[PDB]
Symmetry: D3
Subunit: 236 residues, 6 copies
């Protein structure tokens, strides 16, 4: 099977990081194709950029010329999944929902640790809309921008771990979800330092996307995610 794993931002090095983690857990016979959208912001940190990323991501998937069996939207708390679900007749899985959904199998409550504080209400809203927020103890921000993470992995890790500790201690989190695609692969280390399961939405999503394909399941086309009615659309 082939899974498109799409970065929500335009920074190809992040796509590479995401794609490696995805390939790390991918089952034998699963090809991971990491895609970087052709336009949008270099990091997605707010409503405008998130909405921009939605179309950029959709555009990027439509431009893809090879057959594929599922699509992973590798952004945390970003828009666009619903657009993909309409356009596509293969399963679409967002790492946000993948992380929360799998975390929920592991503990009474989960917390998300994300980058900037301004992204938390976006993440909170996505989880609520997804019907995954009931078991969310909290969404906490490390206070470090996405692009800042690879420059001082020690400082980045320290910032993430402190929020995880608070989530666990004050919010009663029992599982931590990585709340950014660029955090991919950091889970084991955070786990080592927090003592709770830590879910990387990227690897979580690969397993879910694979499972859906294996189970012969795809997006329901019956209502909300039916193919768009053919009509005049300018651009696109």
């Amino acid at each position: 099977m082939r899974i498109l794993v799409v970065n929500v931002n335009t920074t190809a090095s992040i796509t590479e990081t995401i794609a490696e983690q995805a390939r790390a857990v991918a089952s034998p016979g699963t090809e991971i194709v990491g895609l970087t959208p052709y336009f949008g912001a270099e990091s997605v940190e707010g409503n405008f950029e998130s909405y921009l990323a939605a179309i950029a991501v959709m555009d990027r998937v439509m431009a893809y010329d090879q057959p594929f069996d599922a699509v992973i939207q590798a952004g945390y708390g970003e828009h666009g999944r619903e657009g993909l679900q309409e356009l596509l007749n293969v399963p679409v899985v967002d790492i946000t929902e993948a992380a929360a959904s799998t975390a929920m199998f592991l503990g009474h409550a989960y917390s998300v640790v994300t980058t900037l504080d301004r992204t938390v209400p976006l993440i909170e809203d996505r989880l609520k809309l997804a019907g995954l927020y009931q078991r969310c103890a909290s969404v906490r921000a490390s206070g470090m921008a996405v692009l800042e993470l690879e420059e001082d992995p020690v400082a980045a890790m320290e910032a993430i771990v402190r929020q995880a500790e608070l989530a666990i201690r004050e919010d009663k989190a029992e599982v931590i979800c990585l709340g950014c695609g660029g955090m991919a692969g950091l889970d084991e280390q955070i786990r080592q330092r927090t003592g709770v399961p830590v879910v990387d939405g990227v690897t979580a999503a690969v397993t879910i996307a694979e499972s859906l394909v294996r189970l012969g399941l795809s997006t329901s086309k019956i209502r909300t995610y039916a193919t768009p009615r053919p009509k005049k659309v300018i651009g696109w």
Copy 2:
């Protein structure tokens, strides 16, 4: 003051219909400027088109070189308000939230009557995110597409009143909200036929937008709707 009233779809004839209704309730000294986005679908009926509209609407407002004091997004159940709210330092009001919010002053419960059934969950989700869904009795689809409103208006009108009637009888709605920008101006005849107040989000939005400007109020820039962080954003 100047209020930009932006159609979410690319059908210019709908923009005029909306602006005309907006101009009709606008206070003296308030200029209504109706804008049609440069790209997107001729009618927005679903998630892909809605996300496309979101950017189209943001693009259209950003391209507007003249000063303005508030922005109205004239689409029901569409995305994008939050983007404009970040980009702008003026109030932005979406007709969806405008209609529901003023309807809540008028009755114990309101219902929205929209066009297509597939847009019903989009409207439901928007009202929920806006925290205006609790007093919503239902969101109902008339079963007629936006463009059918102008092509077969007698049947469309009847399809709408029928949903309103069911909303009142079965869902216990006490007020009806028009659930489409292209329904602008239809409120009065539905009112006559149902015997309940009918709210037009377009005109509701005009009053709310004016009110915000009059009160010296604008979007909070403190957190969620802070100015976007300066960075590389390509094409």
Copy 3:
């Protein structure tokens, strides 16, 4: 048009203050008539006084000889709106709901800052009943009394700003609603020190009532707020 703005307490100087604030934002040709109930408490601080204020307001409005196009009920967290809505065939707007409703257009979440801790649950209940509580980050009390706002305001002034600050920093409010009828006109310092919009229910209510009249909208008489069935009622 003429709008009745009805104080919920029997302190006439407060009625005057509220009406003056109401007049400041009113459209040309909008006459504001400030009414003081004929009976009730000088300040409404709790359930009993609130229930008493509810009838006092209804009585006061019914006693009103002159034509009017809307009624504003000017207390934060008081009972009675529903009573007026049944009695009247003109729109009724309570400043509590006006404030939260306009605040919701301005930010992801709003908080109400009031006087006494004991009125906090009253406001919460009014907001819940009005279906405006989902985006309320918190209702907070400074702990200083209604009548104290005009008698000892500076320490009070600071106490309110602090609660606004905490609502923003801790509760993640992005908009502040003033929480005392006598708080009309206080937005300036909070706005500047918090950097968030501050909503005055009195002036908000004026704009909404005017708007409803301009929109040709009035209370639905179909069910909940239908005219009371004519029947025997003692002392009315």
Copy 4:
């Protein structure tokens, strides 16, 4: 102990009926005093009458000059309990919350069957505020006003069981609460025809009021229901 059972309306015959119902389950040593307010509507059917009844009830209880150990507010879905709770240093129980609370011990979901449709949202609002609506399957109206019950007891009773049947079948109620103070004593026919427990808020309230006294429990005065602060108050 002495418990006031206060009618919410001014119909003295209903007060005696209610008081009678209370006396039938009252434990030995429990005195029931039925009180009719000095003002208000002969039947409470909506917000205005309800708000009026709240003070009427409060006035009536304050006017009572003999010692008492608890107060029952005997109306379904009217206001005022919180007022009594501030004014009194004895437990206050409203038959509405009394009915719903005890019903919740008996089944997975309960329904309340009331008189008029327009009182339905009032009962709903009271249960929600009381934090008892989660397990409420529905509040249903028979379609007969409070006073019509004592005009045509057969058709009203039929209308009521019908609503109880529908609450069970469609809404998945497993227990029925009577939704009018004046419905007190009517549980039996519904039970036989439905096979479900039927809760009478009046008799329920008696047991709860009694229990609270027996448990040495009274209204918390720490915050919301603290004694009103002394101040100038007219009439």
Copy 5:
């Protein structure tokens, strides 16, 4: 009337304490019978023990051969009530819901003070399922195990009082509910120490059970709590 008051754990001394308290408020003509399950944990502090207690309690009640008019399950935040409700044609009241329900008549919000932190989400879940969580300001753990209540009672009482004080001050609780069966009878001291009403689920439950019997009310057998359907069941009773 006869009311069974069933400990969820197997510590008979706790059954006795619970039973004394039940007897202290029981009306004339009400006989209290305290039962200890034939198996289970000596104290119930978690999901496994709670599920174990559910079956144990059901087993113990079904094994009871003399007549009874109601049953009280005297454990805070444990499973099993619904099972009893199917099995029995008499009212069943769990002290958890009894405490929350009566506290709700007394104040705008109530808080529960329990034993261990790990039991807190269990109580939160039971109150939510019962539809009684809306007026709950918080569920707080004293940090003392159930058995520590009787063996280190000075420290236990103080730890409970501290949580109650925090619940009032920080969570805006107006009423305190005891959040353990082994806390039975401790309300009066906490009330005196806090200045708010304190509800003992055990004594609350007694009055509720008596009330249900007096009102001629029992579990609805129409749907969820219908008699179990007869079928092959292995290793029962």
Copy 6:
């Protein structure tokens, strides 16, 4: 890896059906061990039987004594998951939550179609407890007993489709979850008649359990599901 798949009822023939269905989707290298509890009801249809099964299942997994990497509890709307999670240091996935969780990736809302009307509130409660109920359009009963499914598979199929059709049309479900462990393998027919994805919790659970093992994730032992505290406990 080895995954225990445990029937909640004592009908060994159902265990085989479930294990066979599980083996059909299991990845290479995954062994399925189907287990029947030593005690409990032949079909679990209500609270008492559910509570009895919770312990029966725990008992069965205890005493298994060969090594295993995950456990699937194969009943819809039954209790016990939390007990296993405490007792075990491997992932536990209940087919109820497995079905709903995977269905949520596929449509705006899902409905579960179960057997008896009396099990409906149990399933509802389990989904609520799991924080998976927000996107549940409805839980509907086909009207057939658990054992009635294998007497009479044609009528059962018709009864199930009928509920699925109503769920889709009236409740606006976009995907159907099988609501009985003994319904495993019936999805294709429902899918063919409805045109929406049908999720089988048994096969869904296998993919999730495997996924959790692949991801190196297990139950958080930090709080709610910590190892039970050492104390005096009498067997059963």
